[PDB]
Amino acid sequence: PAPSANPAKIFIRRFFSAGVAKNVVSYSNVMAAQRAMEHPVAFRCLDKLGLTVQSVKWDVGKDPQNTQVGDGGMSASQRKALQQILQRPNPTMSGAQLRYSAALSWACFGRMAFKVSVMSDGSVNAIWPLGIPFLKQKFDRYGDVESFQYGDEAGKETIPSFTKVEKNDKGRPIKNYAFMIVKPSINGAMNFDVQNTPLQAIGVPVALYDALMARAIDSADGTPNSKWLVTASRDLDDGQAKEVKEGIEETKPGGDNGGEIIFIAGTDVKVQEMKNDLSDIHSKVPLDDQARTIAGNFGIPIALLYDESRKAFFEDTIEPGYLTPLEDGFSMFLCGAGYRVIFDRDSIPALRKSRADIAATYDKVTFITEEEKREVTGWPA
Amino acid sequence: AAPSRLVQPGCFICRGVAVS
């Protein structure tokens, strides 16, 4: 089977190098992702994408496209152990929290990293998520990664990858390993390429948003908020002057002579009422555009910040950009053929009406067998 | 760095029978 010779050796010749343990993400990108967590609109979108994926429910199950009659469910007890560990990961952390962390990392850097503790017989004992900013990977000579380094000086655990690890007689590993799921890009370089995150194309809009909010907060405090620039003449007797000033002043709400007229006997004083508009300090027009752009680049219908738009956000951006890739990464190297991790689509509260309508209209149909009517709307057998 | 020497031990044999 495995030929061990991929065409990805175009780089390790000169364009890359083996046995140096390069980091996985640029420090510029790390800082951009850090500061997007305090930026208002960016953090809002980042946490929303989290919550959603954090809500979906897991389990392991038969795959529909089971052409492998020689099922890879090696023991059927490793599958119960996987189910257990998928519902309760490493202690002091739950499956929902692990999902949220994975989704946030995938949205920030285009990477997902985990660590497994399979005991001795394909039975995974625990699963941990990894900090992408401070995880480095070291390649083999041909075309791919062999080891992951976690920590600079003291922490130096060289976790082997799934590709190279002491496998069982069936194929499943026996010792610890890691995943490093990546998002694809241009010009190949499946692991040697640059990341793909929405943060790459929102630098200019976030900078403009910050500049406008700073201008607004500055102009809030500093612009005089008084009306009635009143000016006397250059011949008015300091004291007659103070008296006319007090007469003008003591008409405030709760004063001696409030609301009543002001009588001036000669020496015309001149008042002009200042506008102090102050109603466009934040530039609503070139601020809502930047908000919309930083939302669209993460992939959220503007309306969410109506039920049709919610359905669209769930089934065009959430599902095939966070759910399918994570699920396929887990399916690739977390269990044998024929079985894989699946999430129940009926667990999302928004698609229930749509599912019910499609099930009713299919039940109405007659030229279709019952098993396929089931399978077209979930319900394996 | 300035060129430093590499003086090594010579033919060291005796301590009590110095030749005539």
């Binding site: 390069k22 420090y27 | 003086v7 090594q8 031990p9 010579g10 033919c11 060291f12 044999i13 005796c14």
Partner: protein, 288 residues
């Protein structure tokens, strides 16, 4: 404008003379232990037909104690470049702290001077010190250090004290392995371009911040390169009973709110430890 991730540093530690000394752990900062000065003589070979006996002379049991000394420092920042930086100052500056402690602890435990630092076994100067003879050359009486001395020194350890290792700077080992006989043959490793036996079997642990008698590897000594008699070369001791290193609490880092004046975020770190020389009869010093 193409900043890398390369972080060439090129700075060195020592070896560690820590796993040799006997390790003891105390909770509080004041311990106390006993000591047997001498058993003394009890009973003589008395004559016969003498309805009597002799009280002899009782022994002695001294009672000693020692403290634990602390280690602290301070470092800070400006909080403005730390938000824009292309690195992580804390994770580097924290890393800079044990590297200072780990190297300061080892050296002080070796050469500490009395007050508020554990008295190292060098400055204690109660380890018996053995000085080597000088040699003759062209009438001159330069001091030297031959392989004949090294075997004499390591073998002269009392056998009943136990097995004892040796400690020395690698420049001494390079000096030993590179010795030459009269003809030109090497003394050790005859004809393999390198002499490097498994030190663990010859019980010679190596280090790099010992006094290093061959100054910068430049005083082999025939003329004005003499060893400058009166310099440390190597030591040998049953370390598991000759010297103890006590530990109370590992290093800690605590933000110092107060003193941070909204410009200068000021961190604080510290640690507590100590050491003391036990019976300094197990252990000898070789000198020039």
């Amino acid at each position: 404008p193409q900043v890398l991730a390369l972080e060439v540093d090129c700075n060195i530690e020592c070896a560690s003379l820590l796993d040799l000394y006997g390790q003891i752990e105390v909770s509080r900062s004041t311990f106390t232990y006993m000591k047997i000065a001498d058993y003394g003589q009890l009973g003589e070979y008395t004559c016969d037909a003498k309805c009597d006996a002799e009280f002899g002379e009782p022994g002695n049991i001294r009672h000693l104690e020692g403290k634990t000394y602390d280690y602290r420092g301070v470092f800070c920042f400006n909080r403005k470049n730390l938000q824009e930086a292309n690195y992580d100052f804390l994770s580097f500056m924290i890393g800079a702290a044990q590297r200072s402690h780990r190297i300061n602890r080892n050296q002080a435990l070796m050469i500490g001077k009395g007050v508020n630092e554990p008295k190292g076994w060098l400055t204690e100067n109660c380890f018996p010190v053995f000085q080597t003879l000088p040699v003759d050359v062209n009438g001159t009486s330069t001091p030297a250090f031959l392989a004949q001395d090294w075997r004499r020194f390591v073998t002269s350890f009392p056998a009943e004290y136990g097995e004892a290792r040796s400690v020395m700077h690698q420049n001494v080992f390079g000096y030993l392995a590179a010795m030459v006989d009269a003809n030109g043959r090497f003394l050790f490793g005859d004809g393999d371009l390198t002499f490097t036996p498994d030190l663990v079997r010859e019980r010679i642990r190596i280090s790099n911040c010992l006094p290093d008698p061959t100054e910068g590897n430049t005083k082999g000594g025939t003329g004005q390169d003499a060893f400058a008699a009166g310099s440390f070369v190597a030591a040998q001791a049953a370390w598991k009973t000759a010297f103890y290193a006590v530990e109370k609490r590992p290093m800690f880092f605590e933000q110092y709110e107060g003193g941070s004046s909204a410009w200068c975020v000021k961190y604080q770190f510290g640690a507590e430890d100590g050491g003391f020389v036990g019976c300094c009869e197990h252990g000898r010093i070789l000198q020039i």
